[PDB]
Design a protein around this ligand. Sequence first.
Ligand SMILES: [Mg+2]
Ligand SMILES: [Mg+2]
Ligand SMILES: [Mg+2]
Ligand SMILES: [Mg+2]
Ligand SMILES: [Mg+2]
Ligand SMILES: [Mg+2]
Ligand SMILES: [Mg+2]
Ligand SMILES: [Mg+2]
Ligand SMILES: [Mg+2]
Ligand SMILES: [Mg+2]
Ligand SMILES: [Mg+2]
Ligand SMILES: [Mg+2]
Ligand SMILES: [Mg+2]
Ligand SMILES: [Mg+2]
Ligand SMILES: [Mg+2]
Ligand SMILES: [Mg+2]
Ligand SMILES: [Mg+2]
Ligand SMILES: [Mg+2]
Ligand SMILES: [Mg+2]
Ligand SMILES: [Zn+2]
Lengths: 97, 214, 63, 25, 127
Amino acid sequence: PKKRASNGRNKKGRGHVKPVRCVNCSKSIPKDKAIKRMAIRNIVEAAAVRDLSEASVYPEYALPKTYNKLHYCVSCAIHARIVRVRSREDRKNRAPP
Amino acid sequence: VVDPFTRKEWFDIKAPSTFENRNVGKTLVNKSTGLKSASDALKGRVVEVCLADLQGSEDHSFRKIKLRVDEVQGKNLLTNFHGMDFTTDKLRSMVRKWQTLIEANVTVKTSDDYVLRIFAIAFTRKQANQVKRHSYAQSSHIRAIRKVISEILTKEVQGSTLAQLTSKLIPEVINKEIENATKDIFPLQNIHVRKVKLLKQPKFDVGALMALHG
Amino acid sequence: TPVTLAKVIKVLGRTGSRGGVTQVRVEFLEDTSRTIVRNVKGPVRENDILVLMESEREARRLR
Amino acid sequence: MRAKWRKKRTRRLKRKRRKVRARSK
Amino acid sequence: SQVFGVARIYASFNDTFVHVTDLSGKETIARVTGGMKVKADRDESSPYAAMLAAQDVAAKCKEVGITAVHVKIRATGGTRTKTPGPGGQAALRALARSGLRIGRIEDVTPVPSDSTRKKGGRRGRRL
RNA sequence: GGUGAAAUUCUUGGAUUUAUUGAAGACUAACUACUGCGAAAGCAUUUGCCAAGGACGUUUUCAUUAAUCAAGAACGAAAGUUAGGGGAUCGAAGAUGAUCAGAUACCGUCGUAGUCUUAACCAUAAACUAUGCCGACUAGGGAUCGGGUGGUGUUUUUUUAAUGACCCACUCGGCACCUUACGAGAAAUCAAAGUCUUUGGGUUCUGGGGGGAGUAUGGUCGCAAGGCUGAAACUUAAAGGAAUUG
RNA sequence: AUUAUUGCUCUUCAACGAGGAAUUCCUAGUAAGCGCAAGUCAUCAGCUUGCGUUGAUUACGUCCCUGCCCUUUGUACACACC
Ligand SMILES: [Mg+2]
Ligand SMILES: [Mg+2]
Ligand SMILES: [Mg+2]
Ligand SMILES: [Mg+2]
Ligand SMILES: [Mg+2]
Ligand SMILES: [Mg+2]
Ligand SMILES: [Mg+2]
Ligand SMILES: [Mg+2]
Ligand SMILES: [Mg+2]
Ligand SMILES: [Mg+2]
Ligand SMILES: [Mg+2]
Ligand SMILES: [Mg+2]
Ligand SMILES: [Mg+2]
Ligand SMILES: [Mg+2]
Ligand SMILES: [Mg+2]
Ligand SMILES: [Mg+2]
Ligand SMILES: [Mg+2]
Ligand SMILES: [Mg+2]
Ligand SMILES: [Mg+2]
Ligand SMILES: [Zn+2]
C-alpha cells in the first residue's frame, strides 16, 4: 500500500507545484519532489591551487568558487547521487548528512 | 604561406579619466592599407576589465566594466563608458537560501544625453539576536523598498552625465542612501546597483569626448 | 642531484585498490621539525628510511 | 493488457460497429 | 608588467575549446581544441587531450605576443548541463604550468531566467 | 557535432569557437521552503488600473435569516476540435542513422501537427489526501503563516522618544511536522480512520463475489473525438486486501 | 604377444633455439626439483595414494578482477526466475 506520508515528496496545501527538468536525463518532475543539491565547488581543484598562484599576478589573488543548484529526477537521483535506499525506518529520517 | 602576424598591425589600449591606470592592454588590427584601413574599420571594439584590475585595490573584486573605443590617434586609442557588470561568482554567493531577495530598476537620461538602465539588488538580513532561522520581508515591505530604491536612482542619474554618475557609482554613494531610507522599512544586507547597461548614446561630439584626456 | 633522507614516524594504512601501497608519515633527518606523508611500494615498519627523490610533494588517496 | 490500451482497444471497436451500423441506418 | 589578452575556455563533454583573443574580443590569436590533438571521438574531451592543446595554444600565444591572459571558463550552458566539462581543468592547469601568467578569472556559463523547453521530452532520456 | 560506442549531419560557404549589434516567440531561473493564496482546476518579473476574499479587532448592525442537498447551473490540467493570428523553442505523425535474430521502439537526426494567443467548443485526469459537508466531545509537544493584546524586553541615536525590525508570554484562525495512544482497525496505520454488539447529533452520495463490461441497447449532449445515463444471456470458486516467512 | 605386453643391443637422429591470445597452482620444511613404496598387476605407469631426500624467491596486504556469504530493499514468484 501507501509507503510514504509525504507521498511522492513535500506537498501539502497546494495541489499543483510546477515542473523542473532533471539535470541528468531532462525528465520533468514537480519541483517539490525534485531532489536538489548545491554544487558549490572551487573553479580550480585539488592540485591546481599551487600551480595557479605560482604563475599568476596579484598576491595570492582572491579565488571565486562556482555555485549551481542541481535538480535530479529520482531515477537519476537513485542511479548515482543521494538515495542509497534506506530501511523502512531510516527512510523517515529527514536529517541531511 | 601567410601567417597573418607577419603582417598584423599592432596597438595598445588606453583608459579614460576617473579611475587609476589609463593604460590597459594591447590589440591587433591589420595594416592601414588603401582600401580597408586599420582606422575606421574596427577600433570601435570594447574591453571588459574588472575595475580592481584597473583601480589597484581589491575592495572592488566584483564590478566588471565595459569600455568602448571611439577615437584613435597614432598608436594611442582612447575609450569611454559602455556599461558595468557583476562577477558571476559574487551573486551566486550573495544569493543564499533562507532569505528574501529584492530587485528593481529604471530607465533614464543624463546631462550629456546618454540613456541608460541601472539595476539594484538587496537581500533581507537576520538581525543580531534573531531567533527564527530565516527572516523574510512582508511583500508590502518589498513593494516599499523597491519604490524607495526607485525614487533614489531616478535622482542619482541625470546628474552630470555618466561622468558624474561614474564618479557617483565608484565610491557606492548610492548603496548607502539606499541603506539609509531602507532601514526604516526592513534590515537588509549587501545592497548594490549590480548592473547598468547603455542603450542610447547621443552624438560623437569629438570635443566633449576629449574632456577625459590629457 | 639533491638526495633527501626521511625517517618513517608512523604507519597509516594501505591505499591502492589492489592494496600493495601503504600510507606513511616520515621525518627527514637533514633538518627535522617538519613532516610529509608519502606512499611506499614495498613492506614497511616504523623507523625505516625512505629516499625521497624529490623533497617536497605528497599524495593521499590511491584508486 | 495494460488497462489503458484495453480502453483504446474497445474505443476503436465501438467506432467500427459505429461505422458498420451506419451502412443500414 | 605583461601584455594582456583573454583566454576563454569552453569546456563541454566530448570536446574542450581553448582560444586566446585580444582583450577586446574582436581579434583572435591562436585556437586549437581537444578534438585536434587526438583522434577517437570517444576521447575528444579527455584531460590528456586538453593538455596537448593547452600546450599548442600556449606556444603560439607566447610566439606571437601575449605574455599573459585572463580566463573566462565556460560550459555548454543554455538549457543544458551547465556543469564544467572534464578537460577544462587540465587545460587551465596546462597553460599556467606552461609559462604564461594568470589574472582574475570568472565563469561565463550562459544561465537563463529559465525556459525554452529542454530537449528530450517529458519522460526524459531513458536507456 | 552527437553517444556506452558510432553513424546519418555541418564544414573555402571559414564551419564549431569569438566579437559587436538586431529581430522573433516562449518563459519567469537562482531567492523557492514540509512557506502563501484559491471552490477546485490552479496561481512565482515590475508598475498602473479594476473589482473580489479569508483571517483578525469589534460593548456596531439584522435576528433564525441556517445545515446538507435529487433536478438544474457556474468553473473545470493536458491533449483534442472550428476560425484568425503566432509559429523562437521542444516536438504525437512521418522519414532517417545506428542497435536487434527481428527493432514498426528505446538512443541519434530531419521535422508535420502541436506547443503560445484571440473568438468559440470539448468536460475528461492516479482532477488523489485514492479519505463528503455542518456541529460537539476526547491528549501531549516544539516550530512556523496572518491578526490581535500584554512589556520600567533587545537592537536602531539624536536629545530622549516616535518608528521599524527583533525578543519573551498569551490568544484566535491557517499550512504542517513530532511523541504518545485512553481509543480504533484485517492489518499497514489513524487526533481521526476515535467517542460502534455499552450499536442513534444533522445530512448528501456510492458499493453488495469475480468475469462478462463500462460491453449491448434506448435516450441525450457534442462539429468530431467522444461525455452522461447504462443492462442481460453466458461463464466462474475464487478474484481481492493487509501483514509473515521464504 | 601379429595391430608390434615389457625388458636388452646395434643402427636410424625428427620436432623442439623458452613458446600468441589466453590460463592453472601456491605462503615454510611450503613452492619447485628428485626419486621410492603401495594400489592396479601373469605380463604392462608417462596414472594415482602416500613417502622421504635437496630446498628457495615473494605476501603477512587489499576489494581491482572473479567467486560466494551477509544485510537492506522490490516482488503479482511459494512447483519459488528452469
Ligand atoms: Mg508497491
Ligand atoms: Mg492535481
Ligand atoms: Mg449505402
Ligand atoms: Mg534505466
Ligand atoms: Mg524572477
Ligand atoms: Mg448533480
Ligand atoms: Mg427531468
Ligand atoms: Mg511549430
Ligand atoms: Mg518513427
Ligand atoms: Mg532500420
Ligand atoms: Mg511506426
Ligand atoms: Mg471520473
Ligand atoms: Mg496524490
Ligand atoms: Mg494539539
Ligand atoms: Mg507589541
Ligand atoms: Mg502486499
Ligand atoms: Mg607396481
Ligand atoms: Mg587409472
Ligand atoms: Mg517481504
Ligand atoms: Zn533524471
